[PDB]
């Protein structure tokens, strides 16, 4: 008569490493490394992203004619790696990264006409401000959100327009400063020759002088146009004053910025799915603590590691014999 003490063994081939010995076959185990994703760009916090298609943020916020995309809210922004469509008229976009970052997630967004075109500029020409650098259906055109003002009937009066923010939230205001290639063009566009532009709120204040020189052609333009922006706080006023060279605001955006999100640049399609962790390669749906999909993630994510295998033993050494 015998009584024996013993332990289980099964048909398992799963292997784990221990500190003392590598490749121990065990009866049961679990994976701690999430290595799957869904190859989709999905919603975050239930909120879809802003997909800009073939356009970049600059082209979209300025109103590049090529950028008639479609929301009042977004969790993050998506640009495609092949998104050229932005500053069609060449020049410097000041603090562009900062703006991109600050627009990365908004809880409320509203485009309004801050300086109505039909009524704001009686002493200036607001119809001839177009260029082949910014075509619309092959035709000369310009940013939809700004107006390139030029002299009217051989005169460019000193303009002075102020706007008071009665929106009850931050208003994003963008404008341009045009620099002709020649004194000849300066006179043709603005008459005056030696001009200035002044923008100031209660916070913001900067003076601009045209910088006239022949620069290397870009999209066939030897001239330059620099783009500027600011956020006018509720109740604050912003004032524009110019004697030439000012590319006035037409549309501005009232908004409530949301904590801080990010910008994904990927060809990965968007779908009607939901996630808590987003990767440029697809969403991660895991309860696991570690992940080796992508280091650049947005949301509440597992930690990125360069592990290929993170397998925890649960059972014991498998020795069927």
């Amino acid at each position: 008569d015998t009584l024996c003490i013993g332990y289980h063994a099964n048909n398992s081939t799963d292997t784990v490493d221990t500190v003392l010995e590598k490749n121990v076959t065990v009866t049961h185990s679990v994976n701690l490394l999430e290595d799957k994703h869904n190859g989709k760009l999905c919603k975050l916090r239930g909120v879809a992203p802003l997909h800009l298609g073939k356009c970049n943020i600059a082209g979209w916020i300025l109103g590049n004619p090529e950028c008639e995309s479609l929301a009042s809210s977004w969790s993050y922004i998506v640009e495609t790696p092949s998104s050229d469509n932005g500053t069609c008229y060449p020049g410097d976009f000041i603090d562009y990264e900062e703006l991109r970052e600050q627009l990365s997630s908004v809880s409320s967004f509203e485009r309004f006409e801050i300086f109505p075109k039909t009524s704001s500029w009686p002493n200036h020409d607001s119809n001839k401000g177009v260029t082949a650098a910014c075509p619309h259906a092959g035709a000369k055109s310009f940013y939809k959100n700004l107006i390139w003002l030029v002299k009217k009937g051989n005169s460019y009066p000193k303009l002075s327009k102020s706007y008071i923010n009665d929106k009850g939230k931050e208003v994003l205001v963008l404008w341009g400063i045009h620099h002709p290639s020649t004194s000849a063009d300066q006179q043709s566009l603005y008459q005056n020759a030696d001009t200035y532009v002044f923008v100031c709120s209660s916070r913001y204040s900067k003076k601009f002088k045209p910088e006239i020189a022949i620069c290397p052609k870009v999209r066939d333009q030897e001239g330059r146009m620099n783009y500027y922006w600011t956020l006018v706080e509720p109740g604050d006023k912003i004032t524009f004053e110019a004697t030439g060279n000012l590319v006035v605001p037409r549309y501005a955006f009232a908004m409530e910025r949301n904590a801080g999100s990010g910008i994904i640049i990927s060809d990965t399609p968007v779908h009607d799915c939901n996630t808590t962790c987003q990767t440029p390669k697809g969403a991660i749906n895991t309860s696991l603590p570690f992940q080796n999909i992508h280091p650049i993630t947005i949301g509440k994510c597992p930690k990125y590691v360069k592990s290929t295998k993170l397998r925890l033993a649960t059972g014991l050494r498998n020795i069927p014999s």
Partner: protein, 170 residues
């Protein structure tokens, strides 16, 4: 292993014992076969589940974007950001790898400990009335029917009851 039993003096495992992790193999008139100790098994199942759940659930991470965009005149800060990302990567990689190595050894010790404990629980009960024939088995010096066995497993083996018979077969 640390406790000597599994892959030790108990050299191999029982595929036959499909009902649990640790158990017994009894033999006598009436029959024989494998039977898992459901008490120690369930206990071990609960405890290991808790282990696995601890490693997972203690990871509660902040909402973070990670990605940053810097221009051609922000190379220094672009590389600072890269150092942060890479520092976190080296830390979590080393830590995840070692956690698994270390805790895998611990888990194997744990199973070994559970078995060793079963084995000694039987040993302290039988004493003389049985032969410790090694390899995890005990040979009884007396007849040990089903309810005798069950008793040993249940930890209520009546030593005096079989004392007399036991001595004689010695």
């Amino acid at each position: 292993g640390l406790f000597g039993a599994i892959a030790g003096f108990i050299e191999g495992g029982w595929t036959g014992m499909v009902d649990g992790w640790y158990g017994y193999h009894h033999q006598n008139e009436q029959g024989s076969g494998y039977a898992a100790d459901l008490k120690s098994t369930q206990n071990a199942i609960d405890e290991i589940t808790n282990k696995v759940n601890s490693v997972i659930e203690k990871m509660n991470t902040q909402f973070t974007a990670v990605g940053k965009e810097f221009n051609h005149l922000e190379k220094r800060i672009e590389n600072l950001n890269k150092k942060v990302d890479d520092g976190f990567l080296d830390i979590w990689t080393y830590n995840a790898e070692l956690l698994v190595l270390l805790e895998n050894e611990r888990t194997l010790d744990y199973h070994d400990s559970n078995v060793k404990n079963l084995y000694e629980k039987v040993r302290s009960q039988l004493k003389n009335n049985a032969k410790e024939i090694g390899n995890g088995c005990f040979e009884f010096y007396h007849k040990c029917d089903n309810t005798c066995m069950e008793s040993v497993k249940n930890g209520t083996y009546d030593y005096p009851k079989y004392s007399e018979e036991a001595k004689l077969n010695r």
